[PDB]
Design a protein around this nucleic acid. Structure first.
Lengths: 291, 346
DNA sequence: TATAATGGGAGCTGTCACGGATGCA
DNA sequence: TGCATCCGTGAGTGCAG
C-alpha cells in the first residue's frame, strides 16, 4: 500500500489490527480441535463448525473442565505360571498373560469389597475394619464376580480370566516384582494410571489455567464471585479443556516463554525484536503483542 | 452522506457481547484498576499519572495530550521514560503492567460493545434542544462513566447499570447547553415543574390557569408574584433574523434602534455643554474655577469628600469647601446673565 | 448510582437557464 | 475524444411590511 491511498474502515482494521473470526458451536457439541492449535481454512472445527481463514485457534469459555488426576500405587494379581509372559514392566495395551482355559482369581484375605472400575479394567480393594487389607488388580480379560460393598472369605473367586489378558491403555506397569509358589506366580505391579473428574465452569466463572498444566493439591483451577463454587485442584493432576462457548480463530503467531517477559500487551513490533527471556525468543511477523 | 446512518453503521460493526464476554471484559477492567494502585504502591509514582501511561501505549501513540490533572505534560518521552521504570520490574511485580494493559483494552471493547444501547435511549430524548448526535455523544459520555463504575460481582447485566449514567448525562446536557442563556440545572429543574403542574391544571380546568391557580397547586412558598418572575426568566430569546412578512426582504432586527451609541443630536449636545461650562469657569475666576474644577472633573470627575481636598489645593481643608461655595455662588449669579445653561436640563 | 433494556426518521414534490466538472460508448 | 448529466447559481427599484 502506497502513500496517499484510500482504505475503507475494514481494510484499515486488517492492516492495523489483524484478521480473525469467532465461531459458535451448538452448545454442548465439542471441539474437533483444541486450544493453542495451529489450523487452516476449510478445516473442520466442530460438527456444524468449519473455519474459513488461517491461524492459531483459541478457546473462549470451556463449559467442561476435566482433571486427569495422577495415581501411582501397588496392587497384586496371582496367575498360572504356564500362562504369564515374563516382563519387568507392562506398557499400556500390552498383553501380559494368556490362559489355556478360564482360571478364577481367588481372594487371599477376608474382607469387604471396594470395587473401583476403570474404562477398561478394574481395581479391587478388600478391607476389614476400615484399614485396607489387600489391593488386587484385574486387567482386561478378567471380568469381576463381586459387587461394591460385598463380603469375601479367603480363597473365594473374585473374578475370572478368560483367554488373552492385557494391561489397559490409560494404565502403566512401572516395575513388576514377581514371586512363584505352587504352579503359579503373584505379581505386585507398581501400577500408574489417572482418573477423570469433569468440573463445571459457569458464566460468571473463568478457568485460570492453560490446556494441560501441572497442579499439586491446593491449586486453583477456576475462579468465581463467591469463594464457594470455586474449583480447587484436589491433588496432583493435569488439565483438559472441553466444550467451549465458541472459538476465536485468530491469525497470529505464538511464542512460549519461561522467565520474565520484556514486552507488555498492546505493544507493536516487527521481525527481529526481543519478546522475552533475556533475548532468546523474538519476533517472527510484523504484529502487535498480546501478553 | 447522512451523518446518523453513518454512525449507525460503525456501530453495527462491533458485535453485541454475550453474557460471558460481558463478565470477562467487566472482570479484566476491575482487576486492571486494582492493578494500578498496587502498581502505584510498588513505585509510588501516582495512580492517575500511571493509568494515563497504561492508556497511552494500549491505544497507540495516535493520540497523546498533557492530561490536565496529571502534573507532568504527558509527551511521549515521559511515556517511554515511565514505561521504562515500569517495565523495569520483577516478573512478580511487573506482573501488573501486564494486568493494567490487558484491562484498559477491555474498557475499549466494552464501551464500543454497548454503543447501540445509548442510541436507543437518546432516540427518545429528541425535540428537546439537542441534536440526535449531540444527545448520542452526551449519552456515550455517560456510558464511559458506567464502565469505570461497574461491579460485575453484583451479577447484573451491564445494560441495567449503564442505562442510568446514559440518561443521567443526556438529561444533564439537555439542561446545560440547550438555552442560549444558560441557567443553573436546578432552576431548569423547577421550571419544568411549573410546565408540568400547569399542564394538569389546564387539563382539569378547560382553560389555562392563572398565575394564582399555579402558586396554589405549586404549594407553600409559592405566591402569584413568584410564579410570574419565574416565567419571565424561562423566556427564550428570539432571533434577530426572524423573518418579517411573507416575502422575506425584511428582518425583525432591522426594526430595532441602537440606543447605546450616542445619536448626533446627543454627541453634539455633550460638546456644547462641556465647553459652554468651560465658558463659566474662566469668566469670573480660573483658580477658584480650578479648586472647584477639581472638586469634580472635566473628564473623569474628582469627588470624594474631605481627604484629597485637604492635600494639594493651595489652601486649607474647610477653606476650599468655602471657595467651593463661592465657586458655586459666583456661578449662580454668573449664570444670571449668560442664561444659556438652563436649556440643558431640557 | 444496580431487574432488563444494545442500528433513526422524515422526506415534499408544478421554475429555469447557464456554465462549469464529472462520468461513459 | 465527443457528449450526456449533475450541481450550484442566479433570477429589477423603492414604499407599505
Amino acid at each position: 500500500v502506497e502513500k496517499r491511498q484510500l482504505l475503507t474502515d475494514e481494510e484499515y482494521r486488517e492492516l492495523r489490527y489483524g484478521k480473525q473470526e469467532t465461531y459458535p458451536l451448538p452448545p454442548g457439541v465439542d471441539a474437533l480441535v483444541k486450544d493453542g492449535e495451529e489450523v487452516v481454512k476449510g478445516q473442520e472445527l466442530a460438527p456444524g463448525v468449519v473455519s474459513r481463514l488461517d491461524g492459531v485457534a483459541l478457546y473462549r469459555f470451556p463449559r467442561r473442565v476435566r482433571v486427569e488426576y495422577v495415581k501411582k500405587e501397588r496392587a497384586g494379581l496371582r496367575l498360572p505360571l504356564a500362562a504369564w509372559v515374563e516382563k519387568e514392566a507392562y506398557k499400556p495395551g500390552e498383553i501380559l498373560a494368556e490362559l489355556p482355559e478360564p482360571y478364577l482369581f481367588r481372594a487371599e484375605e477376608e474382607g469387604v469389597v471396594e470395587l473401583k472400575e476403570l474404562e477398561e479394567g478394574a481395581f479391587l480393594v478388600l478391607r476389614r475394619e476400615d484399614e485396607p487389607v489387600a489391593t488386587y488388580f484385574l486387567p482386561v480379560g478378567m471380568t469381576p464376580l463381586v459387587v461394591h460393598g460385598e463380603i469375601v472369605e479367603k480363597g473365594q473367586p473374585l473374578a475370572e480370566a478368560k483367554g488373552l489378558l492385557r494391561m489397559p491403555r490409560q494404565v502403566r506397569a512401572a516395575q513388576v516384582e514377581a514371586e512363584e509358589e505352587g504352579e503359579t506366580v503373584y505379581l505386585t505391579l507398581f501400577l500408574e494410571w489417572t482418573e477423570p473428574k469433569d468440573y463445571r465452569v459457569q458464566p460468571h466463572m473463568n478457568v485460570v489455567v492453560p490446556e494441560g498444566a501441572r497442579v499439586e493439591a491446593g491449586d486453583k483451577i477456576v475462579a468465581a464471585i463467591d469463594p464457594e463454587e470455586e474449583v480447587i485442584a484436589e491433588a496432583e493432576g493435569v488439565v483438559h479443556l472441553h466444550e467451549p462457548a465458541s472459538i476465536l480463530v485468530v491469525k497470529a503467531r505464538v511464542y512460549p516463554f519461561e522467565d520474565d517477559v520484556e514486552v507488555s500487551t498492546g505493544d507493536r513490533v516487527a521481525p527481529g525484536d526481543v519478546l522475552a527471556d533475556g533475548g532468546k525468543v523474538k519476533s517472527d511477523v510484523y504484529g502487535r503483542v498480546e501478553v | 452522506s447522512d451523518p446518523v446512518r453513518q454512525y449507525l453503521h460503525e456501530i453495527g460493526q462491533v458485535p453485541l457481547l454475550t453474557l460471558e464476554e460481558e463478565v470477562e471484559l467487566a472482570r479484566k477492567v476491575e482487576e486492571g484498576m486494582e492493578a494500578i494502585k498496587k502498581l502505584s504502591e510498588i513505585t509510588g509514582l501516582d495512580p492517575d499519572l500511571i493509568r494515563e501511561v497504561v492508556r497511552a501505549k494500549i491505544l497507540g501513540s495516535a493520540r497523546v495530550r498533557h492530561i490536565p490533572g496529571l502534573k507532568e505534560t504527558l509527551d511521549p518521552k515521559t511515556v517511554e521514560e515511565i514505561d521504562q521504570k515500569l517495565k523495569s520490574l520483577p516478573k512478580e511485580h511487573k506482573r501488573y503492567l501486564h494486568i493494567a494493559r490487558e484491562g484498559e483494552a477491555a474498557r475499549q471493547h466494552l464501551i464500543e460493545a454497548n454503543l447501540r444501547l445509548v442510541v436507543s435511549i437518546a432516540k427518545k430524548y429528541t425535540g428537546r434542544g439537542l441534536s440526535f448526535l449531540d444527545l448520542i455523544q452526551e449519552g456515550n459520555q455517560g456510558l464511559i462513566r458506567a464502565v469505570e463504575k461497574f461491579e460485575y460481582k453484583r451479577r447484573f447485566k451491564f445494560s441495567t447499570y449503564a442505562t442510568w449514567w446514559i440518561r443521567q448525562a443526556i438529561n444533564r446536557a439537555i439542561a446545560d447547553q440547550a438555552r442560549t442563556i444558560r441557567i443553573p440545572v436546578h432552576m431548569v429543574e423547577t421550571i419544568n415543574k411549573l410546565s408540568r403542574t400547569a399542564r394538569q391544571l389546564q387539563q382539569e380546568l378547560g382553560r389555562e390557569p392563572t398565575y394564582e391557580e399555579i402558586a396554589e397547586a405549586m404549594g407553600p412558598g409559592w405566591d402569584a408574584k413568584r410564579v410570574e418572575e419565574t416565567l419571565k426568566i424561562a423566556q427564550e430569546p428570539v432571533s434577530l433574523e426572524t423573518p418579517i412578512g411573507d416575502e422575506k426582504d425584511s428582518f425583525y432586527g432591522d426594526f430595532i434602534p441602537d440606543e447605546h451609541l450616542p445619536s448626533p443630536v446627543d454627541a453634539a449636545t455633550q460638546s456644547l455643554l462641556s465647553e459652554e461650562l468651560e465658558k463659566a469657569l474662566s469668566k469670573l475666576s480660573e483658580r477658584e474655577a480650578m479648586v472647584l474644577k477639581l472638586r469634580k472633573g472635566l473628564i473623569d470627575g474628582r469627588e470624594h469628600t474631605l481627604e484629597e481636598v485637604g492635600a494639594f489645593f493651595g489652601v486649607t481643608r474647610e477653606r476650599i469647601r468655602q471657595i467651593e461655595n463661592k465657586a458655586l455662588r459666583k456661578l449662580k449669579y454668573h449664570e444670571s446673565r449668560t442664561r444659556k445653561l438652563r436649556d440643558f436640563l431640557d
